[PDB]
Amino acid sequence: MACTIQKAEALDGAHLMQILWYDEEESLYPAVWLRDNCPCSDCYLDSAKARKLLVEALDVNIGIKGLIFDRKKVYITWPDEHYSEFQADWLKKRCFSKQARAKLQRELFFPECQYWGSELQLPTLDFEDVLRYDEHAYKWLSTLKKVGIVRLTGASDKPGEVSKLGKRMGFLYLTFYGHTWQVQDKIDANNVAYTTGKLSFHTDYPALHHPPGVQLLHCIKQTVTGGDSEIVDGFNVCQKLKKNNPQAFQILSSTFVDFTDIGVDYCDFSVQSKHKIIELDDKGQVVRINFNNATRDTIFDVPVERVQPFYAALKEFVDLMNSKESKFTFKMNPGDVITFDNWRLLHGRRSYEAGTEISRHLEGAYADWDVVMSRLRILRQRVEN
Amino acid sequence: MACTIQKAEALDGAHLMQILWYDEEESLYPAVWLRDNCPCSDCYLDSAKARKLLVEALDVNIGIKGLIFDRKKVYITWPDEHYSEFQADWLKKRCFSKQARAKLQRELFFPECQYWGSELQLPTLDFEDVLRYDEHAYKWLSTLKKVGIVRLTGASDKPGEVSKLGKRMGFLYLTFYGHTWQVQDKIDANNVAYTTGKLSFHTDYPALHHPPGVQLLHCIKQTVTGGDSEIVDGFNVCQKLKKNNPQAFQILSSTFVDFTDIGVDYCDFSVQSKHKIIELDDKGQVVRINFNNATRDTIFDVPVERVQPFYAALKEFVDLMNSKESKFTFKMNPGDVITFDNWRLLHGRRSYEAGTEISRHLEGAYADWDVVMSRLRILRQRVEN
Numbered sequence: 001m002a003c004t005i006q007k008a009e010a011l012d013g014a015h016l017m018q019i020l021w022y023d024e025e026e027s028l029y030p031a032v033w034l035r036d037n038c039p040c041s042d043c044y045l046d047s048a049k050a051r052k053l054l055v056e057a058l059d060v061n062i063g064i065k066g067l068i069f070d071r072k073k074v075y076i077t078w079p080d081e082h083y084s085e086f087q088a089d090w091l092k093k094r095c096f097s098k099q100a101r102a103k104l105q106r107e108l109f110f111p112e113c114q115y116w117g118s119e120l121q122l123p124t125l126d127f128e129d130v131l132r133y134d135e136h137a138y139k140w141l142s143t144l145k146k147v148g149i150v151r152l153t154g155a156s157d158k159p160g161e162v163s164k165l166g167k168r169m170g171f172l173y174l175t176f177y178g179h180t181w182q183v184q185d186k187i188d189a190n191n192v193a194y195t196t197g198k199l200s201f202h203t204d205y206p207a208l209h210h211p212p213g214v215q216l217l218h219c220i221k222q223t224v225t226g227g228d229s230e231i232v233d234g235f236n237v238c239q240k241l242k243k244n245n246p247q248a249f250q251i252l253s254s255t256f257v258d259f260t261d262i263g264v265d266y267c268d269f270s271v272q273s274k275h276k277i278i279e280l281d282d283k284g285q286v287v288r289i290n291f292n293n294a295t296r297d298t299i300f301d302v303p304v305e306r307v308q309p310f311y312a313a314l315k316e317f318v319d320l321m322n323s324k325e326s327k328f329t330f331k332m333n334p335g336d337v338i339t340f341d342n343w344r345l346l347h348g349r350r351s352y353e354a355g356t357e358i359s360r361h362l363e364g365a366y367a368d369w370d371v372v373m374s375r376l377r378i379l380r381q382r383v384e385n
Numbered sequence: 386m387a388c389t390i391q392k393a394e395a396l397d398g399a400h401l402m403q404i405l406w407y408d409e410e411e412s413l414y415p416a417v418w419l420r421d422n423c424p425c426s427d428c429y430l431d432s433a434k435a436r437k438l439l440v441e442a443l444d445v446n447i448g449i450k451g452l453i454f455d456r457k458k459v460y461i462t463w464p465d466e467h468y469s470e471f472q473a474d475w476l477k478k479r480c481f482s483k484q485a486r487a488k489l490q491r492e493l494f495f496p497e498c499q500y501w502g503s504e505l506q507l508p509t510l511d512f513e514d515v516l517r518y519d520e521h522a523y524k525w526l527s528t529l530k531k532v533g534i535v536r537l538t539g540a541s542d543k544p545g546e547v548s549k550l551g552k553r554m555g556f557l558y559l560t561f562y563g564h565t566w567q568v569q570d571k572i573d574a575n576n577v578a579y580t581t582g583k584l585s586f587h588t589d590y591p592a593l594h595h596p597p598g599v600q601l602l603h604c605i606k607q608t609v610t611g612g613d614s615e616i617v618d619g620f621n622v623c624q625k626l627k628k629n630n631p632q633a634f635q636i637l638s639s640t641f642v643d644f645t646d647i648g649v650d651y652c653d654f655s656v657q658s659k660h661k662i663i664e665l666d667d668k669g670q671v672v673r674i675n676f677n678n679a680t681r682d683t684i685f686d687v688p689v690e691r692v693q694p695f696y697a698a699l700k701e702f703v704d705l706m707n708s709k710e711s712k713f714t715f716k717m718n719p720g721d722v723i724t725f726d727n728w729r730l731l732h733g734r735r736s737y738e739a740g741t742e743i744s745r746h747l748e749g750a751y752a753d754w755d756v757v758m759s760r761l762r763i764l765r766q767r768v769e770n
């Protein structure tokens with residue numbers, strides 16, 4: 001009854017097609033949108049699933065010249081004698097009602113998040129299962145998206161595991177630190193990450209205008225002298241900050257902060273960016289947190305009077321991150337991999353002791369969220385079919 | 386006189402340091418910013434050029450406890466007995482006056498653009514010179530940034546040339562179409578690019594939330610039956626659109642359009658994005674154009690009443706691109722490479738004739754603007770020194 005056509009007709013100077021479905025619901029489709037989306041082989045390249053029709057070919061004032069229908073299809077003639085057929089279910093799916101558009105957006109983008117604090121139960125899967133089974137890899141990425149982190153257990157204690165995950169997704173995101181990189185204490189460290197020092201809460205690579213969406217971190221070797229991990233849900237923290245300190249929230253979401261990274265690794269580099277620490281979409285929703293205190297530049301491009309208040313805002317934000325209600329602490333063991341949303345979570349590390357041998361070794365890599373969502377969409381189709 | 390200190394003192398409850406320079410100009414530096422940016426080995430990791438100091442260590446209400454100076458340095462004691470030294474020239478550079486901040490921003494980001502229409506003189510350099518000489522590679526990237534395109538002549542007529550350029554920059558941007566990709570007519574084409582059809586003006590890869598910043602395109606083989614290239618300066622076009630049709634400008638800069646790409650190439654993929662076609666920064670300046678008509682989805686997530694007006698806006702925008710005043714047409718020959726800003730220009734191709742042999746073959750690749758600007762900054766330092 002819902003995807004079956006009871007009536008189709010041209011309305012409103014023939015600029016609109018209305019469909020009455022057999023459940024009695026009605027849908028409206030602009031004539032211009034129908035012509036733009038003709039699936040015939042002139043207008044649409046089936047092998048690419050792409051529009052061939054040019055904007056230049058489109059009469060924005062077009063109306064339907066003729067229409068007939070049956071229960072599964074509408075058949076339209078256009079004023080220039082072009083002919084189009086549309087399938088009922090295709091049409092139903094692309095209905096312009098708020099409810100139908102939102103439903104489809106949820107299927108495309110998996111928007112649901114579960115916010116968390118110190119009460120987090122760390123979602124956990126087996127590494128080899130994830131590589132072997134689509135049901136597991138599907139659980140992995142959907143949970144990555146929804147919760148922001150998934151731990152995988154049972155990997156080897158050897159380099160190369162994050163690469164296997166990268167291929168399972170599709171491919172890893174290359175940066176100046178390499179395809180993969182080794183988190184360990186290094187002489188003449190080009191990055192505070194490559195020391196035994198404490199890392200306070202940060203996101204990786206705000207020095208790039210497009211920071212890595214997803215981070216993978218694999219414990220090869222762990223130390224007993226420190227080195228615990230800490231995470232916090234940045235979206236949860238920002239919500240608490242907006243409520244507790246609207247003014248600190250307004251400063252962090254409007255102030256451009258300069259980030260910098262100069263050195264040599266995969267390549268020689270001199271990198272500069274500007275970001276709002278709390279990044280809002282056009283509807284005011286937090287979509288990304290951009291913050292590493294190590295790489296925040298000495299250069300600070302704001303008027304002198306805005307400086308101290310910026311710092312006071314940042315301090316509030318960091319205190320919230322550090323609160324016992326927000327943060328979750330755990331310690332990785334050899335064979336553990338964490339995969340997390342590097343746009344939403346902040347992460348850190350406790351200091352540990354330097355020594356003559358390497359007491360501690362992680363391998364990390366990055367992936368792009370579009371690459372991950374692509375794999376998530378394909379996996380879902382496979383597991384539901 | 387300008388970088389030499391005549392007087393330094395603590396003011397405003399010691400929350401501010403003022404410097405009188407020997408030219409009689411004055412600079413103010415917040416106490417919090419000075420402490421945050423202490424260069425001592427406790428606070429700052431010289432090998433990484435990164436801040437070690439945590440936000441948690443910073444008293445946002447700090448004032449200077451004591452200060453002395455000489456002509457090249459200030460020496461500060463803090464209330465908790467921490468001690469800092471700052472160099473005059475370091476301080477002068479990071480002055481918070483609007484003029485000093487803007488000057489430094491120009492050095493970091495190379496913001497200048499030369500807008501153009503059909504009168505464009507296509508900037509042109511030799512390929513091997515660019516690979517061999519920093520003076521040339523510097524001219525290449527600075528002109529790429531400023532004008533939005535540079536043509537390189539004298540490459541081979543063989544695959545692998547865009548890779549050489551990728552390494553000269555640093556590295557290429559991997560996508561689902563590969564590290565490099567071959568633009569030629571293909572059976573079961575996964576993309577309208579891989580046919581003999583006309584490509585109207587578009588940017589590449591709006592199906593990604595972070596489209597490629599820079600595109601490289603190398604003519605291996607060219608056809609006499611068509612296949613001319615066309616470019617347009619999208620920033621120039623948007624400026625003309627805002628003026629001629631403010632309403633069309635407002636619709637294209639505020640409406641989220643869905644892009645899609647589903648298929649198999651480097652990997653299997655199902656990619657989805659949303660973008661405003663004319664993307665504005667927070668000050669209302671156009672920073673990116675996101676538009677490929679082939680990959681614009683059938684799904685269109687707006688209320689029914691906004692549909693036809695969107696199409697009318699888009700049509701105006703495309704007509705402007707196609708105007709004889711805006712567009713620049715040229716034809717690539719074997720050995721030519723074009724490198725251009727894929728955020729600013731739109732590009733296209735005239736149709737040509739199918740046949741049994743391959744009459745036409747380009748190799749393309751992408752690079753990220755941060756990778757390109759990094760190389761641009763390093764090159765400048767080398768060529769000026």
Ligand SMILES: CN(CCC(=O)O)[N+](C)(C)C
Nearest residue numbers: 177191193204205206292
């Ligand atoms: C880039 N990075 C994270 C820290 C940073 O943002 O500088 N590595 C761990 C890869 C060094």
Ligand SMILES: CN(CCC(=O)O)[N+](C)(C)C
Nearest residue numbers: 562576578589590591677
């Ligand atoms: C992705 N691409 C450009 C066209 C597109 O945006 O789909 N290739 C030329 C690489 C096919």
Ligand SMILES: O=C(O)CNC(=O)C(=O)O
Nearest residue numbers: 183193199204347348349
């Ligand atoms: O060493 C760790 O536990 C975590 N590392 C990082 O967050 C990093 O290298 O940026």
Ligand SMILES: O=C(O)CNC(=O)C(=O)O
Nearest residue numbers: 568578584589732733734
């Ligand atoms: O074939 C050409 O001349 C230009 N190609 C493209 O713009 C493309 O492949 O997206």
Ligand SMILES: NCCCCCCN
Nearest residue numbers: 068070075076077083
């Ligand atoms: N079953 C309806 C077929 C209509 C074809 C019309 C061609 N102009």
Ligand SMILES: NCCCCCCN
Nearest residue numbers: 453455460461462468
């Ligand atoms: N030339 C000035 C040196 C000042 C050192 C002060 C240490 N507290």
Ligand SMILES: [Zn+2]
Nearest residue numbers: 038040042043
């Ligand atoms: Zn058609």
Ligand SMILES: [Zn+2]
Nearest residue numbers: 202203204347
């Ligand atoms: Zn990190």
Ligand SMILES: [Zn+2]
Nearest residue numbers: 423425427428
């Ligand atoms: Zn110090």
Ligand SMILES: [Zn+2]
Nearest residue numbers: 587588589732
């Ligand atoms: Zn293209």
